[PDB]
Design a protein around this ligand. Sequence first.
Ligand SMILES: [Cl-]
Ligand SMILES: [Cl-]
Lengths: 297, 297
Amino acid sequence: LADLFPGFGSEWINTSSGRIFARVGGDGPPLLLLHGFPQTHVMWHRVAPKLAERFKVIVADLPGYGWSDMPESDEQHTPYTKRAMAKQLIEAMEQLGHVHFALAGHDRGARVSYRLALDSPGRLSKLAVLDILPTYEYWQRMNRAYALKIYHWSFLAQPAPLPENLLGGDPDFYVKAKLASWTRAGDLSAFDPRAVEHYRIAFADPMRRHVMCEDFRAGAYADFEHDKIDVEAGNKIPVPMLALWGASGIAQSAATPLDVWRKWASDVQGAPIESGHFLPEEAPDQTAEALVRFFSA
Amino acid sequence: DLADLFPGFGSEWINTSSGRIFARVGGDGPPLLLLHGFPQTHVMWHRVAPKLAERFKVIVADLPGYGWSDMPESDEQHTPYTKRAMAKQLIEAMEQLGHVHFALAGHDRGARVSYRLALDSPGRLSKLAVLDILPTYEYWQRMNRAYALKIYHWSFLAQPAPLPENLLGGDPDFYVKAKLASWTRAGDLSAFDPRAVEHYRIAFADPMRRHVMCEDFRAGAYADFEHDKIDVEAGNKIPVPMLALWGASGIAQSAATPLDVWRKWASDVQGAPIESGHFLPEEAPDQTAEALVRFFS
Ligand SMILES: [Cl-]
Ligand SMILES: [Cl-]
């Protein structure tokens, strides 16, 4: 596997829930970057060098993803809920001496990030979420068109071992088809092939695939319920926030994302980028610029 | 060696312009066509067909593309596996036997063929029974988070080829067995005759048969839904005398019953719940047969 972060160090950070692997580089204010599904920390490799010119950049594998440890799950999928992942990453950052930091997340990692902001706003100076709406909003929008467009939320949330058994026959095909299908052009051309190999190797481990399913089970059940409590109470994130989405990504399906996020956050700005879902790989210079300017201001 | 489960029944291959329909044919008296659904074949009627054959000529047919019926070549609109087309093909098959006016009972996908037949060509039917379904339009209108999770396979199997076909080829035995067990009351395979399960497993083992099933669900998400929507928008109701049976632990419990739903779709309909999961003729054969004999006689 290739080293896609030249000159970055590595940390394997202990927490009460297991180790978090991260690449660490740069200097300045601390900035945590969180990937999502079906990727690992390496999805930040095209923007992390530029961010490291201005920040101390921590590029972490989510709990149970990449090289982080895989806690045993339970009937409520607890360790893979975004509430639990957020708590674990807060512990990891404390091990580095970071108790107040900037945070950018994409896909599942963006869900960790906004849940972190709802549960522990004091931990964050600023927050960016990439190509997501809150989990509650995806489910509330559920109808025939959405069910057909974004089927994997309900498929991967089916009780074990059904998605695990389907994914086991030809995992390479599924993960490559997902990566391609969510890009603007619909192929793998936006990705460095060395980064694709990182994603493929992680997806080839049945234990890693089980974690991904637990993540989507949490997304169907406890994560949705946590979100429902906040929206029905009118709780809004007070942390200054940036929502970036792809004009051809998942979040924009049939919703104006900034209007959605303004219901969830009291100080949010946002913009689309011409891109499918994988903003930091499909549109690295614009994503890095948007992030550097937001976190620097 | 697949078991013969229809004592006293012949075996017929009926020609049509779209390919052969296989049927078991037994009894004498007025004609009654029985239509299975997913993931089964005609053999799912083996516990109720003898009781019906006491009073009717009973034709137990494999749906177009299912079981031993031929598989017509599909197209980009999934036309031969739309319920409108399947109904036309089965009307042709019944004409080959000289039946232009007959009674009809269907279950699952076969009940969708059946009510579409009644909407398109009511003159063909003396009486109509549907087992543990609502109209396809109604299920899609109900497709919120809860239904997306319970009825996930309507969206999963409708994904563009080859996504479900590729996933299903890894371990088809596991998937067909799960789709049999999961909606029974028991949640296991104990309601089924093991010899019937082997019929279902052997059919599902064939990639070409699984592809047909996916085309059926693709039609169900697209053309079948549009055909139903036209009838709803036109206020069209089935005039054929109708029976709606459903499982007490089948269709999810609502403040409205399945009979309430079918009364909006049909002007002369009676209904009753059966103590059963989804698979009424196998989980509750005595109660199902009694209700059908009483209705059709
Ligand atoms: Cl996501
Ligand atoms: Cl989203």
